[PDB]
Design a binder for these strands. Structure first.
Ligand SMILES: Nc1ncnc2c1ncn2[C@@H]1O[C@H](CSCC[C@H](N)C(=O)O)[C@@H](O)[C@H]1O
Ligand SMILES: [K+]
Ligand SMILES: [K+]
Ligand SMILES: [K+]
Ligand SMILES: [K+]
Ligand SMILES: [K+]
Ligand SMILES: [K+]
Ligand SMILES: [K+]
Ligand SMILES: [K+]
Ligand SMILES: [Mg+2]
Ligand SMILES: [Mg+2]
Ligand SMILES: [Mg+2]
Ligand SMILES: [Mg+2]
Ligand SMILES: [Mg+2]
Ligand SMILES: [Mg+2]
Ligand SMILES: [Mg+2]
Ligand SMILES: [Mg+2]
Ligand SMILES: [Mg+2]
Ligand SMILES: [Mg+2]
Ligand SMILES: [Mg+2]
Ligand SMILES: [Mg+2]
Ligand SMILES: [Mg+2]
Ligand SMILES: [Mg+2]
Ligand SMILES: [Mg+2]
Ligand SMILES: [Mg+2]
Ligand SMILES: [Mg+2]
Ligand SMILES: [Mg+2]
Ligand SMILES: [Mg+2]
Ligand SMILES: [Mg+2]
Ligand SMILES: [Mg+2]
Ligand SMILES: [Mg+2]
Ligand SMILES: [Mg+2]
Ligand SMILES: [Mg+2]
Ligand SMILES: [Mg+2]
Ligand SMILES: [Mg+2]
Ligand SMILES: [Mg+2]
Ligand SMILES: [Mg+2]
Ligand SMILES: [Mg+2]
Ligand SMILES: [Mg+2]
Lengths: 53, 307
RNA sequence: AAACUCCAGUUGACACAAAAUAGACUACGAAAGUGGCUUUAACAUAUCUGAACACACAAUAGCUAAGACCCAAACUGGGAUUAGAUACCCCACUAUGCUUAGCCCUAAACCUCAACAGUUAAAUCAACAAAACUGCUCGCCAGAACACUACGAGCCACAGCUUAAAACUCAAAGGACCUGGCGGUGCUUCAUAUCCCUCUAGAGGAGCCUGUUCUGUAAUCGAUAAACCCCGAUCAACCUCACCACCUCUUGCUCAGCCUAUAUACCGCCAUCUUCAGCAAACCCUGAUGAAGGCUACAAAGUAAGCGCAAGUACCCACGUAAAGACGUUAGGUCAAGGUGUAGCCCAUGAGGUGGCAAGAAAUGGGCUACAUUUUCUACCCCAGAAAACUACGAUAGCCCUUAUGAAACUUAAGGGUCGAAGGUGGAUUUAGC
C-alpha cells in the first residue's frame, strides 16, 4: 500500500412494494378493454395368502 | 361523526404559525385541514385529494376561507405536476401533512363500495370517476389468475391463506360476475367454515369479518396506495422547506413501513441521513380516544424535519 | 438508538455488599447445605429397622415488621428489532437478593441408587443407567387420562400447602434400544467449467422466429420443478387428424371395430441421480441365537459367484470423445408407436363424406437478427476503393408483385419492389465452455 502509486491526489417502486403493480394494472386493463385424504392400512396388518396356498 | 385522528398531536407537531405555507396531500373530509386553519388565522394552506367529491368539499369549504385554503385534485404522483403548474417548484412548504388511508366519507357512503358490511357497487376506488377507465375492485377480481390474485391479498392484505381465498374468487366469478361488496364478502367468507366468518379478531381483540383484510388488499391495489405513497413522500421532500416539519399518519403498519424507512433513509426492501425525528414515537391514539373512534386505532404518526 | 455530561482519567479516604488463587482438592453435615480470617461453644446412639400426620429441620422464591443498600434485578418506563415482540438485544429503576424477629414448608429437595447386614460362587445380564445378587425391615405401587384437580380435614398458610377421589372418555399410555428421515446440526476433506470469486461469449432490454401459459373459439391430445416448454413432430394449407358442425352407413378393410377409461395393471422404449460405484445369490461368524452387525496389512471374521465400474472395442493413438453405466430412487414419461390385463361402447364411445378451427388483450421459455467502425457496401478471398447518423447501421417484420410446389397458396417457400420501425450493447437475476 505504501509502495503503491495513487497518483495526483485531488427503476420501479413496484419491486420495492413486492408486486409488479404496473404489469398487473395493464393485465386488468387489457381485460377491461375486452369487457368494454384416504385410509392407509398398517403395513404389519397387511394380509397374506402364502400359508393358504 | 369522525373526529380527525390525532388532530391535537398533528397541530402541535406542525405548530402552524403566521408566515408559513403548508400543504395537505389528502384533504378528504377536511377535518385535519380545518383544524389547521383554526389555530392560525393567517396561515396559508394547499389541499389535494384523489377523490373529486373530496375536492368539491374543499371548494365548497374554500368559501369559509377564500385564499387561506387552496383546493387541488389529483394523485400523489400527479401532485408535483399540478403544483408545478402553480409554479411553486421549490415550494418552501413548512409542513406537508400526508394523511393516509380511506376517507371516513368514502367508507361511510355505501355507494362508494368500500364497506363490506353494507351493499354497494364493488368500486373500492378513491377516484370518483375522474378517470372513468381506472379499474375497480370488481374488475381486478374477475381478471387476475389465482397466482396473481393471491399476491394482492397475501402482501397488501397480510392474507396467510392467499391460495385459499383466491381460489374461491376464481370459482365464484365463473359462476356469476362479482359486482357487489356483499357478494365478495360472502365469497371470501365461504372459503372458510361457517364458524370462521367472525372468529378473527381485531388488534383490540374485537371480532371482525374474515374478509376485512381482503377488502384492504383490493383497496391498496386498485388505488396503488403503496407505490403512490413512495412518490408522494419523495415529492413532499422536494417541495418541503429546509427545517420544515413533515407529519404522516400510517393507519396500518403496512403503509407505515414505507413512511418508517423513507424518513430514516433505509432501503425499502452510505450517504448520510437527512431527517430529524422530533416525534419519533409511533403510537396509537389515546385508548380513551380509540374507543370513541375505533377506525383510527392503528394510526401511527411519524413526524420528521427535512435536513 | 436511547441514556449520562454535578461526566471521564490519575491519586487518596472509604461498607450492615460479595468472599480470586488455593480447589487438578473431594472434605464437613441428617438432609437442606457448607470454600476470606480469628476465638468461644460444638458435631446423638457399646444391636439393627422404625411415621405425609408425632418431634425437630428443610435451597430458591414469597409474606409480616423494622433496618442497610455497593452491585445485580422480576415488574415498570424508555431505545431498538419485527408482519406483530406486552420477547430475545441496549439503558434506567423498584419489589427482592442482605441484617434482625416472625411466618410460609415448596424443588429435576436427584447418585432420579430406602435403611441395615452379607456375598463375588452361580445364570453375568431384557435394554440403558450405575457389575450381579442374597438376608431383613419400613415406606410405596397396581392401564392411560381426568388429576401437583373436586370435596372433606388439618395448618400463623386466605390466588397457599399437605392428604387426595369419582363420573364421562379411550385401547392403548409408557420405558429402553435400532433403522430411516430431518436438523436456521458439529468437524475434516472436497467439487475443476465447478458451489463462490476469477476467464470468455451469452440470456434478462429491442424486433422477429418458435414453444408454452392464459384468454378466445362450435372446435384435439400428451409433455408440463430439477428430469416440460423448436418436447412426441428428422415437422399440421387438404391429407396428416386423433378435434368441431352437418349429412351418411350398420356382420361394418378384418372369423369386426374403438386414438374409450385406467401409465396407480403392464410389456415395449426411456428420463433422473449417473459429471455415481455400488448391488448381490449362496455360506460363515458376532450380539446369550433381540431389532441388528461383520474393518484394522507389523491386520482383529469374513469368503464371496454373478452384474456394474474396469478391461476391451468404435473414431485419428495407449489421449480425448463417444459408447457403456448394475441394483435402486421419483406408483417419473408414454394405453395416442405398436401390443396388451381390467372395465366400458356395439344403430355407436365404431366407420365414411363435406366444410371448418387453430386467433392474440397479454405473460413467459428458447432461438434468430441487431444495435455498428475488429463496423457497412463492392472487388478480392486478406497489401484495394468507397460508406459512415433522420438517404448511416438495423426486419428473415408489414404491404405490393412475380416465381416454385400443389388439384387447391391473402396463407407455404424463394426472389424482387416498396417501406427504413424499435434498437444506441440491456437492472435483480441467469446459461455454457478446460
Ligand atoms: N394517492 C393519493 N393521492 C391523493 N389523495 C389520496 C391518495 N390516496 C388516498 N387519497 C385520499 O386521501 C384521503 C385519506 S383518508 C381522509 C383523511 C383526511 N385528512 C380527512 O379529512 O379525513 C382520502 O380522501 C383518500 O381518497
Ligand atoms: K475471599
Ligand atoms: K440430579
Ligand atoms: K439419525
Ligand atoms: K441480451
Ligand atoms: K414404466
Ligand atoms: K399402448
Ligand atoms: K388398455
Ligand atoms: K432469448
Ligand atoms: Mg432409628
Ligand atoms: Mg420420615
Ligand atoms: Mg404411614
Ligand atoms: Mg411433604
Ligand atoms: Mg425454608
Ligand atoms: Mg426473604
Ligand atoms: Mg444498578
Ligand atoms: Mg432496592
Ligand atoms: Mg440439591
Ligand atoms: Mg428408611
Ligand atoms: Mg391410572
Ligand atoms: Mg406443586
Ligand atoms: Mg390443591
Ligand atoms: Mg379443600
Ligand atoms: Mg428478449
Ligand atoms: Mg396434461
Ligand atoms: Mg400424465
Ligand atoms: Mg416432473
Ligand atoms: Mg377434412
Ligand atoms: Mg386438417
Ligand atoms: Mg374415435
Ligand atoms: Mg409410471
Ligand atoms: Mg481411451
Ligand atoms: Mg453418453
Ligand atoms: Mg466401460
Ligand atoms: Mg404417475
Ligand atoms: Mg364417432
Ligand atoms: Mg422483407
Ligand atoms: Mg401454379
Ligand atoms: Mg438505411
Amino acid at each position: 500500500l505504501a509502495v503503491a502509486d495513487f497518483g495526483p491526489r485531488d427503476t420501479t417502486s413496484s419491486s420495492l412494494c413486492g408486486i409488479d403493480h404496473e404489469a398487473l394494472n395493464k393485465q386488468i386493463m387489457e381485460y377491461k378493454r375486452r369487457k368494454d385424504g384416504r385410509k392407509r392400512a398398517k403395513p404389519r396388518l397387511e394380509q397374506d395368502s402364502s400359508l393358504k396356498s | 361523526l369522525h373526529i380527525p385522528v390525532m388532530v391535537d398531536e398533528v397541530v402541535h407537531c406542525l405548530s402552524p404559525q403566521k408566515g408559513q405555507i403548508f400543504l395537505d396531500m389528502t384533504f378528504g373530509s377536511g377535518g385535519h385541514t380545518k383544524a389547521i386553519l383554526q389555530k392560525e388565522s393567517d396561515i396559508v394552506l394547499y389541499a389535494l385529494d384523489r377523490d373529486p367529491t373530496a375536492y368539491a368539499l374543499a371548494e365548497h369549504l374554500s368559501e369559509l376561507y377564500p385564499k387561506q385554503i387552496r383546493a387541488m385534485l389529483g394523485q400523489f404522483s400527479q401532485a408535483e405536476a399540478l403544483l408545478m403548474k402553480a409554479g411553486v417548484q421549490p415550494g418552501t412548504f413548512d409542513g406537508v401533512l400526508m394523511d393516509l388511508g380511506c376517507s371516513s366519507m368514502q367508507l361511510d357512503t355505501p355507494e362508494r363500495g368500500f364497506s363490506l358490511r353494507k351493499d354497494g357497487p364493488l368500486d373500492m376506488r378513491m377516484d370518483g370517476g375522474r378517470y372513468p377507465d381506472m379499474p375497480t375492485a370488481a374488475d381486478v377480481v374477475n381478471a387476475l389468475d389465482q397466482q396473481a390474485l393471491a399476491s394482492i391479498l397475501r402482501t397488501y392484505g397480510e392474507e396467510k391463506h392467499a391460495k385459499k381465498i383466491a381460489s374461491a374468487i376464481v370459482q365464484a366469478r365463473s359462476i356469476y360476475p362479482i359486482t357487489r361488496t356483499q357478494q365478495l364478502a360472502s365469497i371470501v367468507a365461504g372459503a372458510f367454515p361457517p364458524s370462521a366468518i367472525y372468529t378473527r379478531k381485531d388488534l383490540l381483540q374485537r371480532s371482525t369479518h374474515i374478509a376485512t383484510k381482503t377488502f384492504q388488499a383490493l383497496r391498496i391495489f386498485v388505488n396503488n396506495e403503496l407505490n403512490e405513497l413512495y412518490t408522494g413522500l419523495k415529492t413532499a421532500q422536494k417541495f418541503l422547506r429546509p427545517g420544515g416539519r413533515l407529519v404522516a399518519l400510517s393507519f396500518h403498519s403496512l403503509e407505515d413501513r414505507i413512511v418508517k424507512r423513507f424518513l430514516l433513509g433505509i432501503s425499502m426492501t452510505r450517504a448520510p441521513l437527512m431527517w430529524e425525528l422530533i416525534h419519533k414515537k409511533v403510537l396509537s391514539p389515546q385508548d380513551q380516544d380509540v374507543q370513541d373512534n375505533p377506525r383510527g386505532r392503528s394510526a401511527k404518526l411519524r413526524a420528521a424535519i427535512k435536513l
